[PDB]
Every structure is written in structure tokens, then in C-alpha cells.
Coordinates of N, CA and C in Angstrom, one line a residue:
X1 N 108.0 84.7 104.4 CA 107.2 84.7 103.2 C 107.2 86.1 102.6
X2 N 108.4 86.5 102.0 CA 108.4 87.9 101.6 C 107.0 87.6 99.9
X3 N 107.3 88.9 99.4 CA 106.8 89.3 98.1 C 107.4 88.9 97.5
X4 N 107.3 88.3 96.1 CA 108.5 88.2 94.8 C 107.3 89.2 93.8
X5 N 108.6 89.7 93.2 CA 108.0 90.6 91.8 C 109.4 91.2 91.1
X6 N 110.7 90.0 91.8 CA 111.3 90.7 90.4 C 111.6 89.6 89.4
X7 N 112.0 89.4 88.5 CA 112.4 89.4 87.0 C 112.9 87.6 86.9
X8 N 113.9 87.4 88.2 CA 114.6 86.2 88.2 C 113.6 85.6 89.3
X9 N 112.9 86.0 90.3 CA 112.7 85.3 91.2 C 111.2 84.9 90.8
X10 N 110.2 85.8 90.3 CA 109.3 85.1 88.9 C 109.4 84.4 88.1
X11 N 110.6 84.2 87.7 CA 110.6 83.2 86.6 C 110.6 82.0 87.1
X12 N 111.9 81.8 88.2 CA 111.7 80.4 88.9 C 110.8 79.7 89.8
X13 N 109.5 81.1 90.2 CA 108.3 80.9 90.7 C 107.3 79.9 89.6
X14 N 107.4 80.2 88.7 CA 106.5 80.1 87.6 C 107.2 78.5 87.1
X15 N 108.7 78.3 86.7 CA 108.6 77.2 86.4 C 109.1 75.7 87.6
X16 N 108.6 76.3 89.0 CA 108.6 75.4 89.9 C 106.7 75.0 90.2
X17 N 106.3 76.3 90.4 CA 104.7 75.8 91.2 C 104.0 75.9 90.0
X18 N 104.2 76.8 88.8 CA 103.3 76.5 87.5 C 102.6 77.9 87.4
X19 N 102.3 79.1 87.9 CA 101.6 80.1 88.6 C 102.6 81.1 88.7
X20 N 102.0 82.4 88.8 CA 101.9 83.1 89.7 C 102.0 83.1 90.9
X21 N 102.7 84.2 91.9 CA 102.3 84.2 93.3 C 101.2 85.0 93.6
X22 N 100.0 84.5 94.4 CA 98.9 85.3 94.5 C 99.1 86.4 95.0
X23 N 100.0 87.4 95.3 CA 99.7 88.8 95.3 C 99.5 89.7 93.7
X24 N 99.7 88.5 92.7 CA 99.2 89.4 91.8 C 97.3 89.6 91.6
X25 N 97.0 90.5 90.8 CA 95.5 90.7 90.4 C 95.6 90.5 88.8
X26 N 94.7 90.8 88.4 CA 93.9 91.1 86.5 C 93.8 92.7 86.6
X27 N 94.0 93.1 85.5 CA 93.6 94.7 85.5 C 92.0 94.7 85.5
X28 N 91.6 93.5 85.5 CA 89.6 93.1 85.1 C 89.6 93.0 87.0
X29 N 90.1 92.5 88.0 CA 90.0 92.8 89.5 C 89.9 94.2 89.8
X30 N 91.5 94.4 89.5 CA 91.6 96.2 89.7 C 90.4 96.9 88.7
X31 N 90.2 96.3 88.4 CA 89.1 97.6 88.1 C 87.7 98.0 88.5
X32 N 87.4 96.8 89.1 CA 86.3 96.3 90.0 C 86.2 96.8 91.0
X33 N 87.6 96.9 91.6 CA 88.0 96.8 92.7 C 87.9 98.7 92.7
X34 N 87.7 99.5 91.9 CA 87.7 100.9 91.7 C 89.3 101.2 91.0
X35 N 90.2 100.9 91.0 CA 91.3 100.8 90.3 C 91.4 102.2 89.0
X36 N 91.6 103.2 89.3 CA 91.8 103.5 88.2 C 93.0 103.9 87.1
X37 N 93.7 102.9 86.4 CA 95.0 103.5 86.0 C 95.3 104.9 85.4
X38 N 94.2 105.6 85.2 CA 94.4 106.9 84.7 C 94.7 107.6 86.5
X39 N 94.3 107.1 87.4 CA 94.5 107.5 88.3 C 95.4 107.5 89.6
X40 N 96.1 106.2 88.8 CA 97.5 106.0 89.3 C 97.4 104.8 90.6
X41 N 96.2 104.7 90.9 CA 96.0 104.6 92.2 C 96.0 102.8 92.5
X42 N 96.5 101.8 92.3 CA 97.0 100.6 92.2 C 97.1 100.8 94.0
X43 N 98.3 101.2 94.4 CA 98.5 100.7 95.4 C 97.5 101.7 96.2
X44 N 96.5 102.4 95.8 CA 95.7 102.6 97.1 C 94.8 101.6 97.3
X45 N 94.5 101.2 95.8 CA 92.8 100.1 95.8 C 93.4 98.7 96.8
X46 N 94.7 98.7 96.3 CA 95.4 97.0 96.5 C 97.1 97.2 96.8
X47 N 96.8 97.6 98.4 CA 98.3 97.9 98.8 C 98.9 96.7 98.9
X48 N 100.4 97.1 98.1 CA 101.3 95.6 98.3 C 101.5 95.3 97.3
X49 N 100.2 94.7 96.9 CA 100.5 94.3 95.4 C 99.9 94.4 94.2
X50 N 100.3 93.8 93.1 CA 100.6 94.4 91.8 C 99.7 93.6 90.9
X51 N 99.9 94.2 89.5 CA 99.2 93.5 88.5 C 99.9 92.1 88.2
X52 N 99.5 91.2 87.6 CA 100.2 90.1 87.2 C 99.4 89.2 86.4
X53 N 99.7 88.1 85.4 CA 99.0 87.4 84.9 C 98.0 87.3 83.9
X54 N 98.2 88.9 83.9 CA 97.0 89.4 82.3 C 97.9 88.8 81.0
X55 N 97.1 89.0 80.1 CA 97.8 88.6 78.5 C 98.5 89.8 78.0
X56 N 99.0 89.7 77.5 CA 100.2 90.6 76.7 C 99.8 90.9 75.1
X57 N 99.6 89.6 74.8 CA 99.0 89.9 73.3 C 100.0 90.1 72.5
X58 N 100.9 89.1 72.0 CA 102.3 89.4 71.2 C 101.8 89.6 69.6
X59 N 100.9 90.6 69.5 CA 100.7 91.1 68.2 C 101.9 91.6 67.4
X60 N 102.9 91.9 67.8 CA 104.1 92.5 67.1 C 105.3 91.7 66.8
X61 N 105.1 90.3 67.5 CA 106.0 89.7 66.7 C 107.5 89.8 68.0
X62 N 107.4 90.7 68.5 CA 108.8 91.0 69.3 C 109.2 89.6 70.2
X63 N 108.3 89.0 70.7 CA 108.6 87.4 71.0 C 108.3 86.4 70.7
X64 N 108.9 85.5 70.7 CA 108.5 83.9 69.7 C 106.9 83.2 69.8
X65 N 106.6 82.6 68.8 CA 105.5 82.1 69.3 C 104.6 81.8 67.4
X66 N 103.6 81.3 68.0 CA 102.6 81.0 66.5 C 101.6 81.2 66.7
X67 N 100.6 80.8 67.2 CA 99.5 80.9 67.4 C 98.5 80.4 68.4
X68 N 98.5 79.3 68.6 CA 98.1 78.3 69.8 C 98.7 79.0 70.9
X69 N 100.2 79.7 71.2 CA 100.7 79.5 72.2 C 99.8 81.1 72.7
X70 N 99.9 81.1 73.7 CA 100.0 82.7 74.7 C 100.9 82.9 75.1
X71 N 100.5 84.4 75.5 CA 101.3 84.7 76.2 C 100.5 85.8 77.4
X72 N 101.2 85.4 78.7 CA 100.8 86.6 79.5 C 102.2 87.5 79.8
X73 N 101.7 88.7 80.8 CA 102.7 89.5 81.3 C 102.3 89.6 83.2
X74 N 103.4 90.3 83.8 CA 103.5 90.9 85.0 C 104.5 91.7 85.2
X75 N 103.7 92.3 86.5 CA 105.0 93.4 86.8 C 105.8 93.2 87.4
X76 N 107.0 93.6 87.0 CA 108.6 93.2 87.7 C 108.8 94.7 88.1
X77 N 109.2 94.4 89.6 CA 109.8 95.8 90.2 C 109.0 97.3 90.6
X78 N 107.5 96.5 90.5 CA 106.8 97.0 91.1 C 106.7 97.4 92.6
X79 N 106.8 99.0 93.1 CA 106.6 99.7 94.1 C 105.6 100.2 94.4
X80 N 104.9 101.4 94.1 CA 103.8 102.0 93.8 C 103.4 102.8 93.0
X81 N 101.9 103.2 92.4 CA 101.8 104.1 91.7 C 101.4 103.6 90.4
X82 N 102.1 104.0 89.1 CA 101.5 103.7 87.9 C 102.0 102.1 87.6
X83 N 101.6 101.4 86.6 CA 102.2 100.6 85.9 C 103.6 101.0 84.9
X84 N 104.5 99.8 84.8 CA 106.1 100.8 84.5 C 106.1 99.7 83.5
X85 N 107.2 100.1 83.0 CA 108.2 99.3 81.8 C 108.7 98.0 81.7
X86 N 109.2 97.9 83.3 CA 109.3 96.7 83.3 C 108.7 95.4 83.8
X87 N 108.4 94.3 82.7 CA 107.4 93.4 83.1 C 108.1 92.0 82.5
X88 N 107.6 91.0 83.3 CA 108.4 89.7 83.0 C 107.4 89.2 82.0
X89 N 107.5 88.5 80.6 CA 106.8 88.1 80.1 C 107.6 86.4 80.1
X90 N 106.0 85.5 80.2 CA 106.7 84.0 80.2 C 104.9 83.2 79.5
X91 N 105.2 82.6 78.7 CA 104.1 81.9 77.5 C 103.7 80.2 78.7
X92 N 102.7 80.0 77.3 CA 102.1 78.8 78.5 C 103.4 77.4 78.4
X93 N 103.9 77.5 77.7 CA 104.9 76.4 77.4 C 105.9 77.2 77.8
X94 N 106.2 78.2 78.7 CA 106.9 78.6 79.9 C 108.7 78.9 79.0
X95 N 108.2 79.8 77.6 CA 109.3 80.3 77.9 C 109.1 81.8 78.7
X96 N 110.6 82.1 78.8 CA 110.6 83.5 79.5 C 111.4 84.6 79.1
X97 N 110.7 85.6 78.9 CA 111.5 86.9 78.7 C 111.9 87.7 79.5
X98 N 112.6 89.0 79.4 CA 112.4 90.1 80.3 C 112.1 91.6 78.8
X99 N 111.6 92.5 79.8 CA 111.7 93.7 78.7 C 111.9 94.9 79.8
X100 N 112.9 95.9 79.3 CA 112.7 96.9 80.3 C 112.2 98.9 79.6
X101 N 111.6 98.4 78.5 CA 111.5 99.5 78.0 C 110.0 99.3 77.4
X102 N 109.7 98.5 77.8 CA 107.7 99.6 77.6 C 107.8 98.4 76.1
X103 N 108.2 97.3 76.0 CA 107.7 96.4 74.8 C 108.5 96.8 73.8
X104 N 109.7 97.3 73.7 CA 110.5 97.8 72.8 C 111.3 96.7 71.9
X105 N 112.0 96.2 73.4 CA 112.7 94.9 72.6 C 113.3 93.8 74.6
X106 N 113.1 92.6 73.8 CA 113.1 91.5 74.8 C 114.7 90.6 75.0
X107 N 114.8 89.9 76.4 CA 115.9 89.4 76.3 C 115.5 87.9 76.9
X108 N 115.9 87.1 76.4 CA 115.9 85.6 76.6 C 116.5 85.3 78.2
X109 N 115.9 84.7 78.9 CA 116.3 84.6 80.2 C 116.1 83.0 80.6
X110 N 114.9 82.6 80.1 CA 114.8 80.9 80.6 C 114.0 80.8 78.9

């Protein structure tokens, strides 16, 4: 039962069991949890694992959508330390993106 947190192996998590794998949290856990991201400290509060399953908030338009739909994000390729660039985003009607540059621009994947 390893970890999944990368890009491909998320996606086909999500459109087999419908979820997330529970090693992710909410940045609203981590922060409870003492979490501070100014403080880098993710894997001290919650060694192993990562953020996952917050909303994204596609204010910008950079991925498809209207209005009813959401969208969340998670972290892809998460080690330790700060939150990074790259994060898998996939909507409730389960399309899926990748991005690797901090929300710049997205690539169609499922």
C-alpha cells in the first residue's frame, strides 16, 4: 500500500474509487493541526503526507468550466517542505488537468 501523489496515478485514483487517497488533508486541517505555510512546516505537523482536495477556484478562466461545476486541486510530487507548482487539478464531473508552473497554463490529461 504505497503513497500515490503523482499526476497519473491520481487521476486514475479519483476516476476509479471517486476520492482522494486519504493521506491527503485541507489547508483548514493543517492549520489546526499548527501547520504553518509561512513556515514551511507541512511535513513536520503531518509527516508523509500532503495537502489534497481543497478548491482551486478557477477564477481565471485557465480551465474549462461554468459555473455549477468545481473545481478542487492537490499536490502532485509532493516531498517535503513548502507547497510547489505542481498540482493535479480534476472538477466534480471529473475532468482532469495537470499544471506545472504555479497555475500558468494547463494540459489535458483525462
Amino acid at each position: 500500500a504505497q503513497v500515490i501523489n503523482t499526476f497519473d496515478g491520481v487521476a486514475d485514483y479519483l476516476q476509479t474509487y471517486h476520492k482522494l487517497p486519504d493521506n491527503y488533508i485541507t489547508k483548514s486541517e493543517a492549520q489546526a493541526l499548527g501547520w504553518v505555510a509561512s513556515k514551511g512546516n507541512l511535513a513536520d505537523v503531518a509527516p508523509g503526507k500532503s495537502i489534497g482536495g481543497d478548491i482551486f477556484s478557477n477564477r481565471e478562466g485557465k480551465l474549462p468550466g461554468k459555473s455549477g461545476r468545481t473545481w478542487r486541486e492537490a499536490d502532485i510530487n509532493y516531498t517535503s517542505g513548502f507547497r510547489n507548482s505542481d498540482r493535479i487539478l480534476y472538477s466534480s464531473d471529473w475532468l482532469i488537468y495537470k499544471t506545472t508552473d504555479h497555475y500558468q497554463t494547463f494540459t489535458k490529461i483525462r
